[PDB]
Design an enzyme around this catalytic site. Structure first.
Site, PDB file in Angstrom:
ATOM      1  N   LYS A 219       0.822  -1.205   0.000  1.00  0.00           N
ATOM      2  CA  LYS A 219       0.000   0.000   0.000  1.00  0.00           C
ATOM      3  C   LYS A 219       0.850   1.246   0.000  1.00  0.00           C
ATOM      4  O   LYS A 219       2.034   1.206   0.304  1.00  0.00           O
ATOM      5  CB  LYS A 219      -1.017   0.046   1.119  1.00  0.00           C
ATOM      6  CG  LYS A 219      -1.817  -1.175   1.134  1.00  0.00           C
ATOM      7  CD  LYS A 219      -3.278  -0.902   1.391  1.00  0.00           C
ATOM      8  CE  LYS A 219      -4.008  -2.185   1.415  1.00  0.00           C
ATOM      9  NZ  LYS A 219      -5.145  -2.018   2.275  1.00  0.00           N
ATOM     10  N   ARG A 253      -3.232 -10.605   4.266  1.00  0.00           N
ATOM     11  CA  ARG A 253      -3.637 -10.640   2.867  1.00  0.00           C
ATOM     12  C   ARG A 253      -2.503  -9.999   2.085  1.00  0.00           C
ATOM     13  O   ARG A 253      -2.261  -8.783   2.243  1.00  0.00           O
ATOM     14  CB  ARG A 253      -4.947  -9.845   2.732  1.00  0.00           C
ATOM     15  CG  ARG A 253      -5.537  -9.830   1.276  1.00  0.00           C
ATOM     16  CD  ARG A 253      -6.768  -8.878   1.164  1.00  0.00           C
ATOM     17  NE  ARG A 253      -7.177  -8.794  -0.228  1.00  0.00           N
ATOM     18  CZ  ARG A 253      -6.727  -7.934  -1.123  1.00  0.00           C
ATOM     19  NH1 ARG A 253      -5.809  -7.024  -0.814  1.00  0.00           N
ATOM     20  NH2 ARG A 253      -7.173  -7.999  -2.363  1.00  0.00           N
TER      21      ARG A 253
HETATM   22  N1  LIG Z   1     -10.466  -7.248   3.507  1.00  0.00           N
HETATM   23  C1  LIG Z   1      -9.570  -6.530   2.826  1.00  0.00           C
HETATM   24  N2  LIG Z   1      -9.729  -6.444   1.492  1.00  0.00           N
HETATM   25  C2  LIG Z   1      -8.942  -5.728   0.675  1.00  0.00           C
HETATM   26  N3  LIG Z   1      -9.123  -5.656  -0.670  1.00  0.00           N
HETATM   27  C3  LIG Z   1     -10.296  -6.078  -1.404  1.00  0.00           C
HETATM   28  C4  LIG Z   1     -10.711  -5.028  -2.443  1.00  0.00           C
HETATM   29  C5  LIG Z   1      -9.908  -5.046  -3.728  1.00  0.00           C
HETATM   30  O1  LIG Z   1      -8.555  -4.756  -3.403  1.00  0.00           O
HETATM   31  C6  LIG Z   1      -7.472  -5.103  -4.199  1.00  0.00           C
HETATM   32  C7  LIG Z   1      -6.200  -4.547  -3.935  1.00  0.00           C
HETATM   33  C8  LIG Z   1      -5.089  -4.854  -4.716  1.00  0.00           C
HETATM   34  C9  LIG Z   1      -5.244  -5.784  -5.752  1.00  0.00           C
HETATM   35  C10 LIG Z   1      -4.089  -6.119  -6.643  1.00  0.00           C
HETATM   36  O2  LIG Z   1      -3.041  -5.474  -6.487  1.00  0.00           O
HETATM   37  O3  LIG Z   1      -4.230  -6.967  -7.564  1.00  0.00           O
HETATM   38  C11 LIG Z   1      -6.504  -6.340  -6.047  1.00  0.00           C
HETATM   39  C12 LIG Z   1      -7.611  -6.014  -5.260  1.00  0.00           C
HETATM   40  C13 LIG Z   1      -7.822  -5.010   1.334  1.00  0.00           C
HETATM   41  N4  LIG Z   1      -6.865  -4.259   0.659  1.00  0.00           N
HETATM   42  O4  LIG Z   1      -6.953  -3.893  -0.500  1.00  0.00           O
HETATM   43  C14 LIG Z   1      -7.694  -5.123   2.788  1.00  0.00           C
HETATM   44  O5  LIG Z   1      -6.733  -4.540   3.345  1.00  0.00           O
HETATM   45  N5  LIG Z   1      -8.557  -5.916   3.454  1.00  0.00           N
END
Ligand SMILES: Nc1nc(NCCCOc2ccc(C(=O)O)cc2)c(N=O)c(=O)[nH]1
Ligand SMILES: Nc1nc(NCCCOc2ccc(C(=O)O)cc2)c(N=O)c(=O)[nH]1
Lengths: 274, 274
Positions: A219, A253
């Site tokens: 991030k 994650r």
């Molecule tokens: N529960 C949870 N879901 C998350 N994400 C789900 C929503 C979509 O987020 C993405 C973030 C990055 C990526 C990627 O880099 O491919 C794909 C999807 C979090 N961070 O993005 C988090 O910190 N916690």
């Protein structure tokens, strides 16, 4: 600590033995279809097997509406993309799958096509009806902290209050306590400085009495601190995963599964997890 | 926390601003001389500049008597190897140097040839006369925990007692309090399990009121936990450096300087160091 296991249909996850690695599925859409084409489903399946082989315990799969640089997408649209990917990864890779969505129709379809966990970035606040999908399928649901402003009176006190509003939505739909996971939502409605403050005080999240997932992988607050681009954030990421496990998280994650799995396992050994 | 800086002749080290990276100098001896030959001094100088460029704050340089797979070596012998390396690195690289030795004659010569810190793996117990060298040159001295047995009554209570016996030797020679650094000696007279127990309880070392150096880089207790060879211990190492900084260490002593410097700096940001 935990007097139960996370029940994931076919799979059980023990929360006492080890920190659980959730691997972030890299979704590269085919320019020429709205979903289910060979190249993009095969990319997804091979990436999941790589992550399984590197140590992942859960595979996380998202549709266009939640994955960064994309516009908002329809429900009908998000289902064509994601459901072929769930079917293939689920049959081909022997691990639970979480579906990353905040839309109740998309969660339902993803579960029917073979998903085990629901990952909601709005914590059942976007569409409360998703907590009804959770309770019915009786699947674990991750309730991430998120809000539509950054006017905090006291960052952590407010996060805990906002997480309880989520928990109250879920339980009022019949979600069993043992199917609730919280997430501090690093990166979501927080300045670079608020993100570090939530890291510094994550242990406070344990008073609510539910397992906590942490997601800091790559991030931009890491880029803020170190002054490094997305592909140079491994070491920064590893720092946040270790602090996160020292502070009581049960999941992380991550993109860099092999690396973060070794750091997780060393940390487990030192804190006395398992 | 610290109401003073580590005074290193030409250099000052602020203990409040950042965790200090000490880089481990790779010494490859020339098969054909007893010291000071071009190939081996040039290897040492280029490795120090690499470590300086990657973020190191102190360069650590050892002679054959303390560096792993070698036999014991004479004092006369250890001085020919190490003193040409000190002279070259000191003139050519603008950072303090620590001389890793437990022998009082070797420490004295190393300082005269340009070293700033003394690093003693026997904590002034091998040759108490080294604490007299420290007090005279008025240089910082690292007193590492070590003993000639593994019969602990209570691992940490005993380590603290053994560290105080070291501190008492140093202060009875006129070593100023501000020139004392402690080290829990991970790897030294401790089982794989005792090493993890000292990691798990490092914060107890802070009651003595001195800065703490930590050195876990690549040690075999990492290999114990992860089941990985020396060159596969980066992630394991990074876990121990983060736990070590969360627990109050001011230094770490590392091989992988670029990597461990990024983890150090992210951790500093999160705990609120600086
Ligand atoms: N529960 C949870 N879901 C998350 N994400 C789900 C929503 C979509 O987020 C993405 C973030 C990055 C990526 C990627 O880099 O491919 C794909 C999807 C979090 N961070 O993005 C988090 O910190 N916690
Ligand atoms: N103070 C301190 N000194 C140490 N070492 C000084 C003695 C020589 O140790 C060496 C260990 C490894 C290496 C190398 O891999 O090149 C060279 C020297 C520590 N660990 O080895 C430690 O944890 N603390």
């Amino acid at each position: 600590k935990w007097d139960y296991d996370l029940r994931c249909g076919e799979y059980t996850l023990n929360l006492n033995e080890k920190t659980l690695i959730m691997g972030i599925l890299n979704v590269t859409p085919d320019s020429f279809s709205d979903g289910g084409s060979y190249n993009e489903v095969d990319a997804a399946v091979r990436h999941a097997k790589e992550m399984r082989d590197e140590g992942a315990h859960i595979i996380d799969i998202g549709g266009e509406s939640t994955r960064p640089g994309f516009a908002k997408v329809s429900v009908e649209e998000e289902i064509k993309r994601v459901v072929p990917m769930i079917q293939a990864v689920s049959k081909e890779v022997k691990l639970p799958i979480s579906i990353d969505t905040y839309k109740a129709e998309v969660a339902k379809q993803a579960i029917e096509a073979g998903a085990h966990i629901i990952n909601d970035i709005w914590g059942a606040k976007a569409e409360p009806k998703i907590a009804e999908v959770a309770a019915h399928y009786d699947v674990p649901i991750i309730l991430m902290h998120n809000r539509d402003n950054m006017n905090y009176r006291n960052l952590m006190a407010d996060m805990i209050a906002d997480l309880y509003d989520s928990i109250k939505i879920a339980k009022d739909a019949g979600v069993r306590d043992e199917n609730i996971i919280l997430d501090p939502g690093i990166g979501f409605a927080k300045t670079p400085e608020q993100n570090l403050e939530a890291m510094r005080n994550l242990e406070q999240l344990n008073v609510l009495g539910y397992p906590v997932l942490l997601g800091t992988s790559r991030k931009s607050f890491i880029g803020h601190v170190l002054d490094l681009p997305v592909e140079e954030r491994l070491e920064g990421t590893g720092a946040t995963v270790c602090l996160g496990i020292e502070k009581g998280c049960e999941f992380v994650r991550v993109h860099d599964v092999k690396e973060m799995s070794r750091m997780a396992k060393m940390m487990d050994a030192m804190i006395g997890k398992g």
